[PDB]
Design a protein around this ligand. Structure first.
Ligand SMILES: O=C(O)[C@H](Cc1ccccc1)C[N+](=O)[O-]
Ligand SMILES: [Zn+2]
Length: 307
């Protein structure tokens, strides 16, 4: 409602409620958190990134995006919880305090706001952006097939009506270009975490090719350690490995792009569950999901500051 402590973390929210939450958290924690507008969506909604910083200086940074696929409600709900948790644990958890004392975190809670608004007003299962061209009656692009990393290769669809439509060219979606510009402008990201649901997976690059990344051994073990940390709280069991070996080919993906920019700790989370409820994860699962996922993310961040 009126403070981040009266905000209900155990229910799903609208775009406007999440956007309001950001302003409240900035107001309450002005020495730690600022709200950045990195662009506007196809339909002209502001695209917001929360910056968590204690100072500097172009500090080494962690990127986290949630809700690129709009129907994956657990992700935006987890993003809100993450934002609050950062303000809770800074000054409290020594490990996390050390991360924020030397690094910045950039958190994008609603990466596809038009899709999110649309899952509230029209179609709960909508996944793509809401871009339209006169070239087709079909709406939207899969924003996680739109990145300039194996763009247009097997693992995406060239058909505008497809749910995995890659768009006409790489970065055609302003929601993607806004991130690309921000990350390129910055130049000093060390981790890039893209949060999705569902399937309980922790994935590293690549999706578009079977070629092993030169950091495979390391990321595989970081992934194993993060999965163990996550499992430790409530027993939630994740599988892990490269995108292509674990699911299948997928092209134009965010972490393939981020990894190719030299951002080593590039991972994609697929949160709860494994299909019991699927996209329609019960609200009662929001806080436990956010809690355990935090443990996994923290594990990755600790490897970033110490490397
Ligand atoms: O099919 C997809 O778009 C995803 C598989 C994937 C996961 C990470 C990078 C690229 C692709 C899963 N996603 O949450 O729907
Ligand atoms: Zn997704």
């Amino acid at each position: 409602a009126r403070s981040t402590n009266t905000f209900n973390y155990a229910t799903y929210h609208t775009l406007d409620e999440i956007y309001d939450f950001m302003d409240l958290l900035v107001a309450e924690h002005p020495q730690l958190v600022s709200k950045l507008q990195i662009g506007r969506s196809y339909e002209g909604r502001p695209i917001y990134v929360l910056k968590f910083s204690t100072g500097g200086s172009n500090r080494p940074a962690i990127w986290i995006d949630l809700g690129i696929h709009s129907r994956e409600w657990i992700t935006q709900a987890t993003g809100v919880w993450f934002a609050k948790k950062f303000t809770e644990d800074y000054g409290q958890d020594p490990s996390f305090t050390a991360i924020l004392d030397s690094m910045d975190i950039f958190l994008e809670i609603v990466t596809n706001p038009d899709g999110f608004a649309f899952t509230h007003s029209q179609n709960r299962l909508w996944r793509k952006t809401r871009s339209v061209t006169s070239s087709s009656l079909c709406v939207g692009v899969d924003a996680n097939r739109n990145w300039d990393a194996g763009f247009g290769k097997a693992g995406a669809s060239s058909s505008p009506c497809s749910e995995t439509y890659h768009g006409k060219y790489a970065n055609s979606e302003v929601e993607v270009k806004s991130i690309v510009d921000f990350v390129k402008d910055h130049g000093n990201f060390k981790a890039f975490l893209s949060i999705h649901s569902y399937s309980q997976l922790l994935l590293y690059p690549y999706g578009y090719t079977t070629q092993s990344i030169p950091d495979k051994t390391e990321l595989n073990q970081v992934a194993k350690s993060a999965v163990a940390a996550l499992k430790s709280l409530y027993g939630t069991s994740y599988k892990y490995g490269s995108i292509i070996t674990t699911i299948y080919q997928a092209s134009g993906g965010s972490i393939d792009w981020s990894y190719n920019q030299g951002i080593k700790y590039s991972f994609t989370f697929e949160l709860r569950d494994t299909g019991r409820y699927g996209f329609l994860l019960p609200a009662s699962q929001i806080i436990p999901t956010a809690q355990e996922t935090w443990l996994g993310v923290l594990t990755i961040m600790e490897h970033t500051v110490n490397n």
